[PDB]
Design a protein around this motif. Structure first.
Motif, PDB file in Angstrom:
ATOM      1  N   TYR A   1      -3.060  -9.410  10.125  1.00 16.09           N
ATOM      2  CA  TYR A   1      -3.434  -7.799   9.959  1.00 16.09           C
ATOM      3  C   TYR A   1      -2.803  -7.611   8.439  1.00 16.09           C
ATOM      4  O   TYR A   1      -2.080  -8.258   7.755  1.00 16.09           O
ATOM      5  CB  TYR A   1      -2.631  -6.959  10.706  1.00 16.09           C
ATOM      6  N   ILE A   2      -3.692  -6.494   8.057  1.00 16.21           N
ATOM      7  CA  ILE A   2      -3.588  -5.873   6.587  1.00 16.21           C
ATOM      8  C   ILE A   2      -3.226  -4.583   6.972  1.00 16.21           C
ATOM      9  O   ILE A   2      -3.585  -3.782   7.634  1.00 16.21           O
ATOM     10  CB  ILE A   2      -4.872  -6.049   5.881  1.00 16.21           C
ATOM     11  N   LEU A   3      -1.998  -4.092   6.065  1.00 14.48           N
ATOM     12  CA  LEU A   3      -1.688  -2.712   6.267  1.00 14.48           C
ATOM     13  C   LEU A   3      -2.290  -2.118   4.887  1.00 14.48           C
ATOM     14  O   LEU A   3      -1.949  -2.610   3.779  1.00 14.48           O
ATOM     15  CB  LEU A   3      -0.216  -2.518   6.345  1.00 14.48           C
ATOM     16  N   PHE A   4      -2.949  -0.805   4.983  1.00 15.84           N
ATOM     17  CA  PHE A   4      -3.371  -0.182   4.006  1.00 15.84           C
ATOM     18  C   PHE A   4      -3.192   1.465   4.087  1.00 15.84           C
ATOM     19  O   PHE A   4      -3.078   1.897   5.567  1.00 15.84           O
ATOM     20  CB  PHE A   4      -5.012   0.004   4.180  1.00 15.84           C
TER      21      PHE A   4
ATOM     22  N   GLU B   1       6.689   1.535   4.109  1.00 13.01           N
ATOM     23  CA  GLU B   1       7.949   1.633   5.018  1.00 13.01           C
ATOM     24  C   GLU B   1       7.506   0.843   6.296  1.00 13.01           C
ATOM     25  O   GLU B   1       8.512   0.431   7.030  1.00 13.01           O
ATOM     26  CB  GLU B   1       8.146   3.011   5.181  1.00 13.01           C
ATOM     27  N   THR B   2       6.244   1.243   6.885  1.00 14.72           N
ATOM     28  CA  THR B   2       5.823   0.438   8.018  1.00 14.72           C
ATOM     29  C   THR B   2       6.148  -1.127   8.036  1.00 14.72           C
ATOM     30  O   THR B   2       6.464  -1.742   8.892  1.00 14.72           O
ATOM     31  CB  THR B   2       4.541   0.771   8.432  1.00 14.72           C
ATOM     32  N   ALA B   3       5.487  -1.653   6.630  1.00 14.98           N
ATOM     33  CA  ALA B   3       5.675  -3.176   6.597  1.00 14.98           C
ATOM     34  C   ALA B   3       7.216  -3.364   6.658  1.00 14.98           C
ATOM     35  O   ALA B   3       7.591  -4.603   7.213  1.00 14.98           O
ATOM     36  CB  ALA B   3       4.965  -3.424   5.191  1.00 14.98           C
ATOM     37  N   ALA B   4       7.995  -2.692   5.935  1.00 10.95           N
ATOM     38  CA  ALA B   4       9.416  -2.970   5.671  1.00 10.95           C
ATOM     39  C   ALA B   4       9.936  -2.867   7.227  1.00 10.95           C
ATOM     40  O   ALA B   4      11.105  -3.762   7.728  1.00 10.95           O
ATOM     41  CB  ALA B   4      10.260  -2.177   4.880  1.00 10.95           C
ATOM     42  N   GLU B   5       9.645  -1.989   8.211  1.00  7.63           N
ATOM     43  CA  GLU B   5      10.364  -1.785   9.293  1.00  7.63           C
ATOM     44  C   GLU B   5       9.725  -3.074  10.176  1.00  7.63           C
ATOM     45  O   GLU B   5      10.441  -3.524  11.170  1.00  7.63           O
ATOM     46  CB  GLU B   5      10.122  -0.440   9.894  1.00  7.63           C
ATOM     47  N   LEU B   6       8.473  -3.341  10.225  1.00  6.38           N
ATOM     48  CA  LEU B   6       8.202  -4.672  10.926  1.00  6.38           C
ATOM     49  C   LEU B   6       8.942  -5.688  10.588  1.00  6.38           C
ATOM     50  O   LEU B   6       9.371  -6.417  11.442  1.00  6.38           O
ATOM     51  CB  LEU B   6       6.563  -4.715  10.803  1.00  6.38           C
TER      52      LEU B   6
ATOM     53  N   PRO C   1       4.809 -10.466   9.651  1.00  3.01           N
ATOM     54  CA  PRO C   1       4.308  -9.562   8.426  1.00  3.01           C
ATOM     55  C   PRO C   1       3.015  -9.449   8.501  1.00  3.01           C
ATOM     56  O   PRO C   1       2.209 -10.422   8.678  1.00  3.01           O
ATOM     57  CB  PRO C   1       4.875 -10.340   7.373  1.00  3.01           C
ATOM     58  N   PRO C   2       2.679  -8.387   7.687  1.00  2.00           N
ATOM     59  CA  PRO C   2       1.076  -8.438   7.244  1.00  2.00           C
ATOM     60  C   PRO C   2       0.608  -9.435   6.164  1.00  2.00           C
ATOM     61  O   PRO C   2       1.453 -10.104   5.473  1.00  2.00           O
ATOM     62  CB  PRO C   2       0.852  -6.950   6.520  1.00  2.00           C
TER      63      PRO C   2
ATOM     64  N   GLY D   1      16.636  -0.508  -3.148  1.00  8.43           N
ATOM     65  CA  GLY D   1      16.855  -1.987  -2.521  1.00  8.43           C
ATOM     66  C   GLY D   1      15.624  -2.319  -1.369  1.00  8.43           C
ATOM     67  O   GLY D   1      15.595  -3.410  -1.270  1.00  8.43           O
ATOM     68  N   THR D   2      14.969  -1.360  -0.966  1.00 13.39           N
ATOM     69  CA  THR D   2      13.965  -1.572   0.260  1.00 13.39           C
ATOM     70  C   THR D   2      12.978  -2.575  -0.474  1.00 13.39           C
ATOM     71  O   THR D   2      12.486  -1.994  -1.547  1.00 13.39           O
ATOM     72  CB  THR D   2      13.486  -0.515   0.823  1.00 13.39           C
ATOM     73  N   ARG D   3      12.520  -3.508  -0.173  1.00  7.85           N
ATOM     74  CA  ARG D   3      11.651  -4.499  -0.664  1.00  7.85           C
ATOM     75  C   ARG D   3      10.757  -4.964   0.484  1.00  7.85           C
ATOM     76  O   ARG D   3      11.383  -5.359   1.503  1.00  7.85           O
ATOM     77  CB  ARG D   3      12.284  -5.452  -1.646  1.00  7.85           C
ATOM     78  N   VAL D   4       9.744  -5.451   0.182  1.00  3.77           N
ATOM     79  CA  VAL D   4       8.756  -6.152   1.211  1.00  3.77           C
ATOM     80  C   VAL D   4       8.692  -7.836   0.597  1.00  3.77           C
ATOM     81  O   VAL D   4       8.969  -7.860  -0.587  1.00  3.77           O
ATOM     82  CB  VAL D   4       7.591  -5.773   1.546  1.00  3.77           C
TER      83      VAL D   4
END
Ligand SMILES: [Cl-]
Length: 247
Positions: free
Chosen positions: A82-85, A96-101, A108-109, A182-185
């Protein structure tokens, strides 16, 4: 999770393009994208509570509440690539949705595509985004000038009052967000931003770059907060294009 909208379901698709809307926004600006998509991609539109099909649900009141509503809906999709846009506030929500997943152990996306938003830790003149409790006229002006209400809607108070209540709800959620340093994907990240929008493109590109450890690409597109009509209509081509360096 709440139901994801899929205007053209594709059981044959290999991947899902998940789209998150802006402050005061529903799925409506993305629905035309279902006409243009390669058959291997299914369009999935997230509807925030309180609008469209979810008009009868209570608004989320804080950022993490809205984020967790999104995550509970997206997580069941993550068994397929999946791709998050996301666009504007939805770009911060997609990040933030990617980081929480990632944090919860979901897959991951394949890519995160952020559009129309400054980098979240660089949260913009205060007067240029009105407060959730500002005068109504200030909210309508802002919507009009960004292209988020039509002339036809702003011509009619009865319809506008609605759009404004929705914006006030989302502005309150966005005001409660604080980026955590520091939040990073780790996923490929593509940044889209328009030459005539509020921030200089060079600053948008520079400050999103440290937010992924993966491949990165930034694309300066014509026009403003919604680019130009022709570019907006074709925007999924920037969602499905591989990020150079990705697998
Ligand atoms: Cl927004």
């Amino acid at each position: 999770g709440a139901a994801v909208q899929r205007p053209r379901p594709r059981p044959g698709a290999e991947r899902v393009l998940v789209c998150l809307s802006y402050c005061g926004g529903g799925t409506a600006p993305f629905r035309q994208w279902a006409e243009d998509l390669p058959e291997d991609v299914e369009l999935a539109l997230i509807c925030y509570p309180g609008r469209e099909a979810r008009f009868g649900a209570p608004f989320a009141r804080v950022w993490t509440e809205l984020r967790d509503d999104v995550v509970r809906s997206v997580r069941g999709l993550t068994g397929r690539p999946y791709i998050l846009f996301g666009h504007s506030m939805g770009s911060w929500m997609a990040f933030e949705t990617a980081a929480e997943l990632e944090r919860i152990g979901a897959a991951p996306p394949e890519a995160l595509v952020v559009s129309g938003g400054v980098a979240p830790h660089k949260r913009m003149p205060r007067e240029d985004t009105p407060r959730s409790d500002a005068d109504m006229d200030a909210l309508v002006r802002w919507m009009r000038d960004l292209g988020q209400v039509s002339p036809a809607i702003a011509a009619e108070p009865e319809l506008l009052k609605i759009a404004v209540d929705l914006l006030r709800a989302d502005l309150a959620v966005t005001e409660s967000y604080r980026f955590v340093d520091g939040t990073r994907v780790s996923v490929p990240l593509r940044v889209l931003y328009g030459t005539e929008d509020a921030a200089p493109f060079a600053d948008v590109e520079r400050h999103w770059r440290p937010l992924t450890a993966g491949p990165f690409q930034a694309v300066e597109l014509p026009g403003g907060h919604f680019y130009t009509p022709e570019v907006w209509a074709r925007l999924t081509e920037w969602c499905t294009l591989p990020v150079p360096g990705a697998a």
